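Final report, results section. Input specification for complex C-07:
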Amino acid sequence: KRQRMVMKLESDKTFPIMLEGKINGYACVVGGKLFRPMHVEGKIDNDVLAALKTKKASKYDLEYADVPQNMRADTFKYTHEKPQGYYSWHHGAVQYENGRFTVPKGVGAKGDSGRPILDNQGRVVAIVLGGVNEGSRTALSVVMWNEKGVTVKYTPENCEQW
Amino acid sequence: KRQRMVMKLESDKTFPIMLEGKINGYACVVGGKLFRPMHVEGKIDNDVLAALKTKKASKYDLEYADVPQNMRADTFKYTHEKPQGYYSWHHGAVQYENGRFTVPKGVGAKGDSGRPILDNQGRVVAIVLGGVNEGSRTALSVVMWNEKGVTVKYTPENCEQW
Amino acid sequence: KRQRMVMKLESDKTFPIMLEGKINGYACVVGGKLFRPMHVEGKIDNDVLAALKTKKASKYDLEYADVPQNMRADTFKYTHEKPQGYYSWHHGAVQYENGRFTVPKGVGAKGDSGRPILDNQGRVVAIVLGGVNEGSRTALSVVMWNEKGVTVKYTPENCEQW
Amino acid sequence: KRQRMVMKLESDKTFPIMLEGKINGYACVVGGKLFRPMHVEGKIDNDVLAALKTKKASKYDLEYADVPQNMRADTFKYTHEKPQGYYSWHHGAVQYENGRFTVPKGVGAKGDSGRPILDNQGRVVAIVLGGVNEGSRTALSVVMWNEKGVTVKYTPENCEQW
Amino acid sequence: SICAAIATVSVAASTWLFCRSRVACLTPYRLTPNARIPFCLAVLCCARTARA
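Structure output:
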């Protein structure tokens, strides 16, 4: 039953990015590191995180920032391992195969960048920067983390920024 | 049930350290070695144990002393291995992951240094020298023992002495 | 019955203009042309429309912009003919005679400029830049569209900008 | 019963100060005079009040403006005399003694500057610029008016701007 | 003068390329909860531990 999956998915919360009352994206924290896409600009909803100094990634199109120690407990847990199957995402479950994550066509658009992908246990596997519809499914320009502790950004051909 | 866990936790006893009627800490003995934090000063409750000559550790902030042979049987058993899960501690069960021990915020304060951590079978895993609350949980500056027979002090940043 | 007229009036939607969380006015699209009063400044609620390049009309106090072809279908229908009678407007029905539109006194204020006037059939007759109360009714400085394809703005004396 | 006091408190209304959709404070009118703290910046909710020319007070940390005569009737009545006791305030009753107003700790924060304090009869005694908690109660840096017709600002030491 | 200009341009290009090197070394490893690796800091020292 998908209802329980949706209920588990809708448990945790993220911090959106605002620009003049418009939500251009989301800014999540995982493992004590603040993340938000660089191409998406705005002000983070929470003032404290918005006050943090951040640095830019030229080829990765996102910013990073260390959360304060007194708040690092309240962070999402990551997973370098990505078993084959379907994963929970805010809009809906994500069916992924061949190392690339796919969503039903017509799901996800601008302002949905940066929303993390959760596993069955709630650990974040990867975050999405954009996606392109290529037929019945829509491949997503997600950035994943490798087992060794590295960062990987699988971007499909001529993908669309969100 | 947590009642059985608490009952198993409250079986063994430790030897606190007194200073002018004030309990600055505890001095436990494991494997024939007397241990007490060096920054914590006082007199141990047991006259013989307090009468034992001790040596100091500069970078570990604890003392070490060997119990007499007739008393080496009556000591706590150590364990080098720390499988993932939760461990029982005097104030409450300790939820640990990624090699660092966490306790619910608001648990643990000054005078709680030197209290050992017990596993399911009662073997001592590590003792805590201090702790700092860093959010929903509270990471503790515990000192662990390695599988090879070495000693490791996983100390979180800007920890508080207890 | 006026209930049915109000219900018919409240069907279609327009695009407001925002300035620092303040709605200075509305920007309507009719016939493939974007319109907004020039004296009223702000940002259009729709991102795409707000990004469109616009040009100014000095003596008409309004801007014009062409919608993209793929979206020209979803726009309001114009009508050059204005037979005598009463017409529907967002706040309420408009009683018009002698070529000038009148509304009850105390109806319509600042920020209501640019809201279109609909006929019985939903076709837009003219849009309002402002109005002045002259007694029991309040004439509005609307700009109407002529039968030959021309543009006329019947502005009452000493009108008030909205 | 305190319920009746709260009901009497919540009758009158004030005019807040908005800055980019954020309620930075409130601007009250008493006796035909517009007031808002100088340290608090923003735009008044009322356009007419917002358009009024104001002057600044260097030490009093507030601005003053004269309302139009047709609206001077609709203003709050003041009282120079402040008998000992408790007074009703928007967040709750204020217990005041020894010439300083105190509120329970945890009551009142940023954005609460400019909120007036009413007597039993609704006549405003003073308005608060800020406050500092010093224990069980919280003194507020309020500005009162003297019986002679003068203005006195009782500021507790190291107060916090609100 | 021309030799001095050539040397200065070479040094500036070396600085640009070394900044690119630091970025290329760290950015794949910065974007992680760990974000610290003893071996890379030993072999290239892309990020200055003392500087913050």
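The CA atoms of residues 38 and 45 of chain E lie 9 Å apart. Chain E touches chain A at residues 23, 27-35, 37 (CB under 8 Å). This concludes the modelling results for the funded period.
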